[PDB]
Amino acid sequence: GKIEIIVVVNGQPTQVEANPNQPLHVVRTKALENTQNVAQPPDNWEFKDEAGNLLDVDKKIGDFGFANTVTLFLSLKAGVAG
Amino acid sequence: MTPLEDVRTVALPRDCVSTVQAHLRSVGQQGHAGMALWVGVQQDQHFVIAETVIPAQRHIRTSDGVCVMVPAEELHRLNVWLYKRGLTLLAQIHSHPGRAYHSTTDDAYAVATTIGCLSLVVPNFAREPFDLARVAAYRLDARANWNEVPSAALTRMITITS
Numbered sequence A: 001g002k003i004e005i006i007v008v009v010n011g012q013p014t015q016v017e018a019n020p021n022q023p024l025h026v027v028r029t030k031a032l033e034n035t036q037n038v039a040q041p042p043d044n045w046e047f048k049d050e051a052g053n054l055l056d057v058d059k060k061i062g063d064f065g066f067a068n069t070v071t072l073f074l075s076l077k078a079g080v081a082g
Numbered sequence B: 001m002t003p004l005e006d007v008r009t010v011a012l013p014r015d016c017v018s019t020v021q022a023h024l025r026s027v028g029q030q031g032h033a034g035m036a037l038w039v040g041v042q043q044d045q046h047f048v049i050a051e052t053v054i055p056a057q058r059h060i061r062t063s064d065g066v067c068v069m070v071p072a073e074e075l076h077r078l079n080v081w082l083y084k085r086g087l088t089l090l091a092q093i094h095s096h097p098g099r100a101y102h103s104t105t106d107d108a109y110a111v112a113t114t115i116g117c118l119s120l121v122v123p124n125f126a127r128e129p130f131d132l133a134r135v136a137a138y139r140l141d142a143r144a145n146w147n148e149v150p151s152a153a154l155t156r157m158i159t160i161t162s
C-alpha cells in the first residue's frame, strides 16, 4: 500500500516511503530534511508533477492514486534578494 | 554521498565570473539589482563550478531600496534542469546599489537553500571588477543562519581558474 516517492529538490533526489493515509505535506517535510534544504521553511515549497501540475499538499497520498513509484519535484514558491 | 556542508574548496572558472559580472553590471546600469547562480559538481570536500545560471527575474522597487524576484515557474525549471544535468546548486550572487551585506530579505528568501550553500553580495551595482575580497559573502548553517564568510576565508575557499 506504501508509495515510493522520489522527491527532487534543487536537482537532488531523495526516496520517501509514503503512507496512503498521510497528507502529501508529510513527504515535503521529510524530503527537505533528507536533502538538507533549510533556508526557507517547508511552508515555502510546493510540489509539481512531471507535467507541471501543482499538487494539493493537504491531500492524502492515497487519494492521488499513484503508481507504486512516482517522481515529484519540490520547488520554492518564491526567491528574493536585495 | 558527501553533503554540500562538507565543501571546503571551490574551483571557479574565470568565464563563470565574467557571466555573473556582465549580468549584474548590465542591470545595474539601469539601477537594478541582479541575481545569478553558480552550479557544478562536488567531489568529496572539493566543488567544481561548471556554469553560471542567470534565472528569469523581475526587478521591483521596495520601500527603501530595490530587490530582484525569481518566480515560482523559474525555480521549478531550475530544479528540473539541475536534475537533468546532474548538477548541484552551490551559490547565489546578487548586487546592492551601495554597500554589500545580507539584508533581512536576503536572509529570508534565498534560492540557494541547502546547508553549506553560499550567498555572495556585490556592491555598487557591480560597477567595479568582480573581486572575492570586495563581496560580502555568507554561508548557510544547519540552523538556517546565513553566517558571514569574511574576505580572508572566502579568498582561501574559492580559487578562480582559467
Ligand SMILES: [Zn+2]
Residues within 6 Å of the ligand: A081, A082, B094, B095, B096, B101, B102, B103, B106, B121
Ligand atoms: Zn541583498
